Design a protein around this ligand. Structure first.
Ligand SMILES: C[C@]12C=CC(=O)C=C1CC[C@@H]1[C@@H]2[C@@H](O)C[C@@]2(C)[C@H]1C[C@H]1O[C@@H](c3ccc(Cc4cccc(N)c4)cc3)O[C@]12C(=O)CO
Ligand SMILES: C[C@]12C=CC(=O)C=C1CC[C@@H]1[C@@H]2[C@@H](O)C[C@@]2(C)[C@H]1C[C@H]1O[C@@H](c3ccc(Cc4cccc(N)c4)cc3)O[C@]12C(=O)CO
Lengths: 240, 9, 238, 10
């Protein structure tokens, strides 16, 4: 009698679902999944970049982890804004050179309007490449946990170095430009909340079943509770 | 996990 | 008063990445293929757990267990796919998942190989008990040309499931064993045409189909072995 | 062979 066949029946894996809904547009599913994949590679590049920021590597490893998790959407939307500005044709979202969403060709109306905002603001202020690099470094240090960092004295000393660096990049009474540029940085918090909210909706939506790389899925998984508990301290340059 | 790996190296 | 740090920031700025996007590749075709690779990745994770639960597999040398899972993954997926499609009462459907069933052209050829498994199990009226022994035997059907590190134990495990398929049939019996082990042999041909398609889509930069990290790693390890014919296909019939 | 090696040792 076949004793092993019964033991094979016990260990047989259950049937898995694909997470496929025909009603979800293929163009929508493709664009969003393709962008989540690109976001994963850009996120790995960003970790490598942050480690090459003078002073970043001095912070506690848990603080380095925290900052990259709290700011990833901010660096992504701000670099997307820059690339879209450097394309010279307004109303374009230059995600990648091979994937340029020409705004013309309304589920992502609220989303697209917040992504275009960064591009339109950079074009309005005529932001140079030296100002952009200081600003992008400052978005990495723009949000902290409500309780605070394990290397807070060092973090504050590092953040002050890049605010000072942004001032040098502008420098007669140019402190109005410093006001205008730090105002754009402050408005990034609102952009990120609208994009992070849509990101969490597609991360958890099983009818749509949009795919994400393991790098982003781990950041999103870790941040969803902190976002809901309001455990984030947005550092501002100007009072709301 | 993956972030900690990329920061460890 | 001079910006010294902003110079270091230019130096370290990451270069622009390409999304891997081609408008010419149908949105439906890219979705189906990417969704199937993601499901296949999760099925492969489950298949590793299943292989460890098989009596005698954990005793093999660790590299031997890895080897069998890399060599037979497509075989296990395709065979289970044929089974699911058969157990749907239509040998004309590809039941990838209960929510992804393909009811029937670059894939016209590859579709015939995937449907072959399904029509063969239908024609042979294969029971669940036979299918299980046959699927365990598939994990033990391809070995490195050079051999395995626990070749003696491997032979013993293999013998046990040929012997177990025999008992499942035993109640004409030899005639049935010939047909089922002939189908096990024809899986090498199905797997060959499927993997050829798999390695083409894995490397095609225009389509840029996405693969989960579990399948990309498997594919990356196996492509050189497949190319150098470094794969010994154990068969029942000459 | 990182991921497969982690599931087998698991
Ligand atoms: C980091 C990331 C990656 C690379 C990159 O260069 C920049 C970023 C920053 C924003 C991230 C993005 C991705 O990961 C995907 C994200 C996370 C996205 C925020 C969410 O907005 C949608 C989304 C994607 C695309 C559009 C363009 C669009 C479509 C239709 C009509 C119009 N007019 C405009 C609109 C909204 O895509 C997101 C998801 O929720 C997906 O699930
Ligand atoms: C393990 C896997 C996963 C889960 C599962 O239950 C069984 C398996 C075994 C077969 C594996 C599959 C996936 O990985 C994807 C594979 C690997 C595929 C072999 C290759 O055939 C194409 C393929 C398969 C199926 C279709 C649907 C379709 C549409 C329109 C018309 C027709 N007639 C059929 C299209 C292309 O998909 C593959 C790729 O190369 C993709 O890049």
């Amino acid at each position: 009698t076949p004793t092993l066949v019964s033991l094979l029946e016990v260990i047989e894996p259950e049937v898995l679902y694909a997470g496929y809904d025909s009603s979800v547009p293929d163009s929508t599913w493709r664009i969003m999944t393709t962008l989540n994949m690109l976001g994963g590679r850009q996120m790995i590049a960003a970790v490598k970049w942050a480690k090459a920021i003078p002073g970043f590597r001095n912070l506690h490893l848990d603080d380095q982890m925290t900052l990259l998790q709290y700011s990833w959407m901010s660096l992504m939307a701000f670099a997307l804004g820059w690339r879209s500005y450097r394309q010279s044709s307004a109303n374009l979202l230059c995600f990648a050179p091979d994937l340029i969403i020409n705004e013309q060709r309304p589920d992502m109306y609220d989303q697209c309007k917040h992504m275009l905002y960064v591009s339109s603001e950079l074009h309005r202020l005529q932001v140079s490449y030296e100002e952009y690099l200081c600003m992008k470094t400052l978005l990495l240090l723009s949000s902290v946990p409500k309780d605070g960092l394990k290397s807070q004295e060092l973090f504050d000393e590092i953040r002050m170095t890049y605010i000072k660096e942004l001032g040098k990049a502008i420098v007669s009474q140019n402190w109005q430009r410093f006001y205008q540029l730090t105002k754009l940085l402050d408005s990034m918090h609102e952009v990120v909340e609208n994009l992070l909210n849509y990101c969490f909706q597609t991360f958890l939506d099983k009818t749509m079943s949009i795919e994400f790389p393991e790098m982003l899925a781990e950041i999103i998984t870790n941040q969803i509770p902190k976002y809901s508990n309001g455990n984030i301290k947005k550092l501002l340059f100007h009072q709301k | 996990n993956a972030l900690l790996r990329y920061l460890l190296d």
